[PDB]
Design a protein around this ligand. Structure first.
Ligand SMILES: *C(=O)CC[C@H](NC(=O)CCCCCCCCCCCCCCC(=O)O)C(=O)O
Ligand SMILES: *C(=O)CC[C@H](NC(=O)CCCCCCCCCCCCCCC(=O)O)C(=O)O
Ligand SMILES: *C(=O)CC[C@H](NC(=O)CCCCCCCCCCCCCCC(=O)O)C(=O)O
Ligand SMILES: [Cl-]
Ligand SMILES: [Zn+2]
Lengths: 29, 21, 29, 21, 29, 21
């Protein structure tokens, strides 16, 4: 089950863009 | 978490923004 | 169902490369 | 459309080129 | 079945990072 | 191969390193 792993890759790219100079936290529960 | 919220349905930019610092 | 959403991300990257200086249209029906 | 054509089977570079300007 | 195709895209990015100046081989069996 | 090994389960960085030159 690498679907979540690959989804997560896209999520971090999207958060980089969204969050900007605020930056973000990435915490897989 | 973000993986539960956003890998089981598409998260808008507004919903992704909940995970910014 | 984020599978189409994530597929689309890869499609746009591929069209950037394919289309070159022509550019492209991305229209999810 | 491109999502129907190319997310349900792999599109070659030739088939992707149908979506260039 | 574009799942393998899209997985492969991520694998090559990961191998670029892992392998560094050694580089890598990508051979879909 | 790498697709069989690493698209059916998550490959660690150590396991990916088997495919370096
Ligand atoms: C494990 O998978 C989670 C189990 C459980 N469930 C949760 O859903 C997490 C809830 C706490 C996270 C913070 C919630 C933020 C405020 C929720 C109000 C809804 C309004 C906005 C909707 C949205 O999130 O987009 C757990 O206890 O963690
Ligand atoms: C909604 O999902 C689409 C419904 C319906 N079906 C279609 O397939 C779209 C057909 C029109 C798009 C332009 C078709 C281009 C020429 C098709 C000839 C086939 C030769 C090349 C094959 C290829 O596309 O790779 C609709 O009416 O839109
Ligand atoms: C076609 O899909 C493959 C069929 C068949 N099966 C294989 O699994 C490939 C085996 C040969 C590849 C080299 C194997 C490396 C050493 C394996 C020892 C296991 C220790 C480390 C585990 C790991 O790989 O992470 C075939 O004959 O090719
Ligand atoms: Cl993907
Ligand atoms: Zn992907």
């Amino acid at each position: 089950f690498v679907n979540q792993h690959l989804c997560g890759s896209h999520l971090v790219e999207a958060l980089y863009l969204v969050c900007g100079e605020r930056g973000f936290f990435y915490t897989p529960k | 978490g973000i993986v539960e919220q956003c890998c089981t349905s598409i998260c808008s930019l507004y919903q992704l923004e909940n995970y910014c610092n």
